[model samples]
Target: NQVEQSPQSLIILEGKNCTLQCNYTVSPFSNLRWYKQDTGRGPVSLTIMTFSENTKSNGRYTATLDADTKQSSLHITASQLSDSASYICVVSDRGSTLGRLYFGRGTQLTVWPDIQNPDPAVYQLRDSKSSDKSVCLFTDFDSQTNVSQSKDSDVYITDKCVLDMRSMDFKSNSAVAWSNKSDFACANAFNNSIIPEDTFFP
Candidate 1:
């Protein structure tokens, strides 16, 4: 049978919490599961397993599943500010290897920080701000003819691939790049996408 949700949705109060109401018509139900996360939402099961499968928890969260009936829900206790971005997802497996996944967008929740008892340290900055820096360096192997140096002693090598230099730090003024000369000698090493130069840096 096809499982469908109605009324489109419902809402839960912040601080005060609520659970998603799921109604499915799938027959021979095998198991159920749930999952939750704060950042980007992904489908997760609150509870999933066969008739023998029981309840489980991943910290403060608890999920319950009953195979007799095709119904399940997630209950959040002692909600926190991070719980605000959680999503509830469910999966139905007909057997150990066969099943289908069903997902609900998620219920947005918010927990207010205690006002009367506020902690001033929560607003303090512990680290100093610094500027972003980068440097270009490379490594080479057997071939001296392919090596060259700039006036500043910076090394340069003739290798085909563009290098990724995002980690270069000018503050330290020390950067290291590497290349494989012997490996590049292999006949199959230099293809259009995986070019020989990709293995070297200077």
Candidate 2:
């Protein structure tokens, strides 16, 4: 069955509660979610969401969810006196199956802050883009710095131009462009590829 699987079995703790850890591989992959509770923890909503759903959190706990089929790990920031033996449960869905729940044995988690500034930006980005002969441009614009990050940055305009053409099925001279705008140019060229000539006029 295509379902979720948690990695670490049991997380140990010295405090009052422990948080569980889960790693999963489920398919038609819909979402990655987390549930946290106190020792003998009673399952609290640390987070919930779908593949399209990003990050969500309730109170002292933060959960990040991904819908792609791969690996996902959860990190507990600050271990509290109450976080001695809490269980963490991971669940998934195809967006409609509510009765079939995939659960991992609660992870035993314990925490001790070693540094004063435990900047816990633990969330990470995973690349799930499969090779489909299509080019993707991911961008991040910073208003404060006035900077933009794109996948097509700085290699060569010609390479991007080539990619633009290839993505639209214009590998041969069968296509022609009427515009200078890259995207528009590609589309125009592609449109010319399918035109047929008069044959039944005899």
Candidate 3:
């Protein structure tokens, strides 16, 4: 029982269209779920379609499936920058809740342009046209010390997935892993990346 996702990453102008295709080889299937994981944020459930269901819709997104052929497609309408995020597909199995999962990734990219001084608490997005203005986005946690900064993340977000950043062994930029139940968050890995005086987006 396996699931396959296509077109790892995509790029289009500000307004356009795009679609993601999925082919699954799972047996004894139960349901399929699609989630959107925003960059620097968590994944939120959008639609859950059982094996008997053919289609589902939410807001500007739609998903379709042919349970007979074990194929599914996620269609997005009226492309907007707000629609930008990592879209992942997870298949639920018939046996147990831990049965099977497949992932299609999306990134709500925050771009930091050429700047002399960067802030860790704030994310500065720049423009190539001119460095006239700075766009910054800040999270609720206004102040974070280096101690907690290394672990400043909500288990609520990453807990939904199996891959833990710490449990993963990054060897030569490739990977293999061990089973570690403790949660490892992405913001922690970025802790060592900046200076004490810098700001961070949490």
Candidate 4:
């Protein structure tokens, strides 16, 4: 059994609409779960549609699945800037508890206000020991001490790592500084990449 996802990455205007598609060939399927993973945070469960349910919605997001075709689609209405995240589809196999979970690589969606001017001040911090990838989108950077500043981040980097600031080809503001000796909880660590969006509403 295999699961496939479309649009490796997508970019959309703010307050617009987009749809994410997911196709799976998993047999003995039980239910399908959709998750939203932000820049460096863990995946957040959006909706879990069982075989009996045809469609489900949470706020501006909706998910629909076809049991016969094993196809599913996630529709986002009036996507906001905060909606920029990775949409993941997980197919739950038939089991009593949490059985084997089939995960899709996920789709990276970026929502920007002005598509012409995209932010490129994003850095990826790679841990030397654990090799964890963390995204630190900062509004300012201090090259003197290799420090990054951010305003929106719950997780921080406790491990000393290299801060290689590069272009992310997306929109992001606010950065997280690297602190090994001191405790900084302003950035989230992605931990790992799981083996596992476009267009018009008001």
Clash pairs, model 3 backbone: 86-106, 119-199, 120-199, 120-200, 121-199, 121-200
**Residue range 1-202, candidate 2, lDDT tens digits:** 2333354454332222333335565545555666556654378756666667655656656555544534445555555434544455556656574535666665654332222221211111225444222222211111111112223332111111111143653211111122222443221222222222221111
Model 1 TM-score on a 0 to 1 scale: 0.43
Candidate 4 per-residue lDDT over residues 77-130, each given as its tens digit: 998778889999999888568578999999999775533432223344455745
Q: Estimate each model's TM-score.
A: 0.43, 0.41, 0.50, 0.57
Cα lDDT listed for each candidate: 0.41, 0.39, 0.54, 0.65
Residue 70, model 2: Cα distance from true site in angstroms: 2.8
Question: Who is ahead in TM-score, 1 or 2?
Answer: 1
Q: Write the per-residue lDDT of candidate 1 for residues 38-108, one digit (tens) a residue.
A: 66655444445565765666666666655566665566776644565555555564664656665554455
What total of clashing residue pairs does each candidate reach? Answer: 17, 14, 6, 10
Taking all chains together, the TM-score of candidate 4 against the true structure is 0.57
- Sorting all predicted structures by TM-score, with the top scorer first, yields 4, 3, 1, 2
> After superposing candidate 3, which stretches have Cα over 4 Å from the reference?
95-202
lDDT of 3: 0.54
